[PDB]
Structure 1
Amino acid sequence: MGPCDIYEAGDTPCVAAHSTTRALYSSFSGALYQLQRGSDDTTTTISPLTAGGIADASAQDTFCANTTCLITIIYDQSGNGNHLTQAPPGGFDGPDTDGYDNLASAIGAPVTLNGQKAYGVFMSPGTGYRNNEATGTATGDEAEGMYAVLDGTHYNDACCFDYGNAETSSTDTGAGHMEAIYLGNSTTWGYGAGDGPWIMVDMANNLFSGADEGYNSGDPSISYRFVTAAVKGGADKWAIRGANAASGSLSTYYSGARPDYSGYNPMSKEGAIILGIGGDNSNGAQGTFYEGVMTSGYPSDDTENSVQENIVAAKYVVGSLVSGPSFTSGEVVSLRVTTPGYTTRYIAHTDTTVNTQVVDDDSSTTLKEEASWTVVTGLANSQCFSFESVDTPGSYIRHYNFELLLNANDGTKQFHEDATFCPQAALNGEGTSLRSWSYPTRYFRHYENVLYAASNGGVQTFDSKTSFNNDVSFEIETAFAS
């Protein structure tokens, strides 16, 4: 049996079921999600390898070879047609065309479920999916349940990384017009114990960690690499349950009456489904979604425990984020441009500006150093890397407003994430392509001899598809600084 089979057995059936990693029904073999490669913009779908099995990743790899990929649709396996597609603008605008949110990369969250490779939805700030005309989802004060397997080490404090019931207009229509899972360390509304992140329930104009608005000590910080967040709401009652999605039981962080504030009882749910964003399209949060569902009816604890066990059985394990040449901590290198007509340039810098310059044996020692980089263990992820300036030790290459700048490590998480890159086999076949860890849809890319964290097409001029593959491919060579 799969998650939804278990929920059906408990009389609180899935009315929405999403996952880019596995089928949530033992008998599902349809499409899990849709892809679109930047090369020609064509699409293809990825289905389980077998009925009720794991996603066919090799098919994605084949289709996305020598190019980039975005996850255009996350199909609803329940049959209700509640697929998730690019989230539209609302109270707030998205950073994409006409205010839509960004689609997520297809390779930002690699994992294996019991030895079988799969891909999750790595969402960076500005990313988001939605369905404002869903069927079967709870409305008004009707009971519902939900859960999602997320990455407890990928999150921030901006509003709002949710998954659940939201407004059909994409605007904040008031308290009680929402009921969704939230995971992050925002403290603007509710928050629990510790540094975070905390699993809270977004009920509109409030992320609740318990009965009271704001602080509630009963909600602990949960930072497992794989987290199961189980939330449910009914007639003047709701609950929060969390667990290590890779081992053990669900613990109950809250169970009881609605917050005693106007608008929260009875609730006024609207039935829309959001992912990675807030109800009014607040899109500054980040996170990773692997699988999740929404149900009709208040799931019993026994039902959720069975689900949790099934998830544990799925055996989630982190996959490799790196491919191609790759580096070793402490190694000193120089990165050469492979784009025809600039093949003698190297990634260097002029103050905080990271650019490409012609560097050779006649170059001064200062320029040789500006073009030499000490590779160190990724500041935000131990699998990837960070590039430290040879001439200016203590400073690293980081993306700011999508430009690559050479700034000093200020020890903050933000800096750490803006300075972590993952080696990927060069797209043009020559060398490596440094993929941004926090923004997997972006790579090191030179545009008019300046370095940006560019995507294959986008709202910034430096995201041009023209010569993209070449501009994101570099040959790893012996450092000039010897």
Structure 2
Amino acid sequence: MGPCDIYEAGDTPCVAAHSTTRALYSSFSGALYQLQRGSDDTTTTISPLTAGGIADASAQDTFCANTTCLITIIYDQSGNGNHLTQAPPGGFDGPDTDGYDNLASAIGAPVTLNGQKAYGVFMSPGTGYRNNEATGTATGDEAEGMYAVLDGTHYNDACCFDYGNAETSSTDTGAGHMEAIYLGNSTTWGYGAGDGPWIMVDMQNNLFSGADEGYNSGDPSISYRFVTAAVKGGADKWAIRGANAASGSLSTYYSGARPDYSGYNPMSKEGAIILGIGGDNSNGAQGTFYEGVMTSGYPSDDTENSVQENIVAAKYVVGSLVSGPSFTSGEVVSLRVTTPGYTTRYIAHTDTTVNTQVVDDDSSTTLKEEASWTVVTGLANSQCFSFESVDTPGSYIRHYNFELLLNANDGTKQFHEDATFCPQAALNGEGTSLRSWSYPTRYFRHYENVLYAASNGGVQTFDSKTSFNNDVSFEIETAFA
């Protein structure tokens, strides 16, 4: 029995079932998600390897070889047609074409499920998915449940990393017009104990950590790499439950009446589905989604408990973010350009500007140090790396407005995330490509001999698809200094 079989047995069946990692019904053998690759802009689907099984990650790796991939569609396994696609503009514009939100990388969230590789949905600020034409989802004050398995360590405080029920117009239509899982450390509305992040419920114009606006002591900080968030709502009742998705049981952090503020009882749900964004298209949040569902009816605690036991049995474990030659902490390197016409250039810097320059044995010692990089444990991810200046110790290559700058580590989460890069076997086969940990659609990329965190196509000039594979491939050489 998969999660949706368990919900059905509790007479609260799934009406939307979304996962890039696995089938959520024991008999589902259809497509889990759609990929689009940058090389030819064509698509393919990824299905489970067996009915009721795990995503064919090998088929993704094959399709995405020597290029970049985006997850274009997360299919609804339930048969209701509630597929998640690129989220449209609403109250807020996204940063993509026509104010759409960005699609996620296919490769930002590698995992294993019982030892088998799969890929989650790693969502950087400005990423979002939606279905405003959803069928079967609860509306008005009708009962529903939902859950998601999320990365409890990938979050921020911006509005809003949500999964669940939202407005069909992509605008704020008032209190009670949403009911979605939220994960992050926003303290604009609700928050819990400790420093966050918190699972809360987005009910529109409020993230609730419980019955009260603001602080609720019973909502703990999440301390799990894989978190099961289970949320449910019915007629003047709702709940927040949380578990380590890798071990043990759901605990209940809120259960009872709707918050006693105008507009939350009865609810006015609209039945649209969102992922990674707020109901009005607020698109500042980040997070990672692995699997989740929405149901018809208010699930029992027992049904949710059987779902959690199923999740634990799936055995989520962190996967490898790194491929290709890679690095050791304390190694000093120079990174040589491989693009035809520029192959004598190395990644260097002039003060804060990271650039490419011709560097050779006759260059000034000043330039040799500027073309030399101390590789250290990733500031935001210990599998990945950060690139420390030899001439300016304590300063690292970071992205800022998607340009690579050499800036001093200020100890902030923002800097750490901006300064962390995951080596990948070079897209042209010549050395390494350095993928942004925080924006895995983007890579170290030279454009007019300046370094950017560029995507393979996009809204910035330096996201040009011309020479992309070459422009993101660098040979790892002995440091000049």
Instruction: Give the TM-score range, shorter chain.
Output: over 0.9
SS in 2 for 1:195: coil
Residue 364 of structure 1: how far off its partner (Å): 1.1
Give, in angstroms, the shift of residue 25 of structure 1: 0.1
Partner deviation per Cα, 1:8-30 (whole Å, 9 max, x = no partner): 00010000000000000000000
C-alpha displacement of 1:120: 0.3
Give the structure 2 partner of residue 56 of structure 1: 56
In structure 1, C-alpha distance between the alignment counterparts of 2:27 and 2:378, rounded to whole Å = 41
Structure 1 CA distance, aligned partners of 2:183 and 2:324? Answer: 33
State the alpha-carbon separation in 1 of the partners of residues 217 and 365 from structure 2. Answer: 57
TM-score with structure 2 length normalisation? 1.00
Residue equivalent to 1:288: 288
Q: CA deviation at 1:140?
A: 0.2
Aligned residues: 481
In the other structure, the counterpart of 2:405 is 405
Whole-angstrom CA distance in 2 between matches of 1:480 and 1:223 = 43
Could you tell me how far 1:363 is from its partner in structure 2?
Answer: 1.0
SS in 2 for 1:313: helix
Hey, what's the Cα distance between the residues in 1 that align with 2:371 and 2:188? 43
CA distance in 1, matches of 2:365, 2:301: 67
Q: Which residue is 1:21 aligned to?
A: 21
Q: Secondary structure at the match of 1:70?
A: strand
Q: For 2:296 and 2:414, how far apart are their aligned partners in 1?
A: 39
- Distance in 2 between the 1:191 and 1:121 partners? 25
SS in structure 1 of the partner of residue 229 of structure 2: strand
What's the TM-score once normalised by structure 1's chain length? Answer: 1.00
> Which 5+ residue runs of structure 1 have no aligned equivalent?
none
Q: Alignment partner of 1:28: what SS? A: coil
C-alpha separation between the residues in 2 aligned to 1:326 and 1:152? Answer: 27
**What is aligned with 1:299?**
299
The root-mean-square deviation of aligned C-alpha atoms, in Å, is: 0.4
| 1:223 Cα deviation from its structure 2 partner | 2.8
Q: In the TM superposition, what is the alpha-carbon distance from 1:365 to its structure 2 partner?
A: 1.0
The Cα shift of 1:31 comes to: 0.2
**Structure 2: where are the runs of 5+ without partners?**
none
Q: Which residue of 1 aligns with 2:197?
A: 197
Over residues 232-265 of structure 1, what are the superposed CA-to-partner deviations in whole Å (9 max), with x where a residue is unaligned? 0000000000010000000000001000000000
SS at match of 1:310: helix
Tell me the distance in 2 between the aligned counterparts of 1:224 and 1:282.
26
Q: Could you tell me how far apart the structure 1 residues matched to 2:195 and 2:472 are? A: 37
After TM superposition, give the deviation of residue 45 of structure 1 in Å. 0.2
1:428 equivalent to 2:428? Answer yes
| Deviation of the 1:167 alpha carbon | 0.1
Cα offsets for 1:429-470 (capped at 9, x unmatched): 100000000000000000000000000000000000000000
Deviations 1:259-305 (A, max 9, x none): 00000000000000000000000000000000000001000000100
- Give the match's secondary structure for 2:18: strand
User: What are the Cα deviations for residues 77-108 of structure 1, in whole angstroms up to 9, with x where unaligned?
Assistant: 00000000000000000000000000000000
Q: CA deviation at 1:64?
A: 0.4
Aligned match of 1:8: 8
Give me the whole-angstrom Cα distance separating, in 2, the residues matched to 1:443 and 1:404: 10
Shift of 1:336: 0.2
The residue number in structure 2 matching 1:132 is 132
Counterpart of 1:303 in 2: which secondary structure? helix
Distance 1:27 1:195 in 2: 42
What is residue 44 of structure 1 aligned with on the other side? 44
> What secondary structure does 1:52 align onto?
coil
C-alpha distance in structure 1 between counterparts of 2:162 and 2:194, whole Å: 20
Q: Distance in 2 between matches of 1:194 and 1:410?
A: 23
Identity %: 100
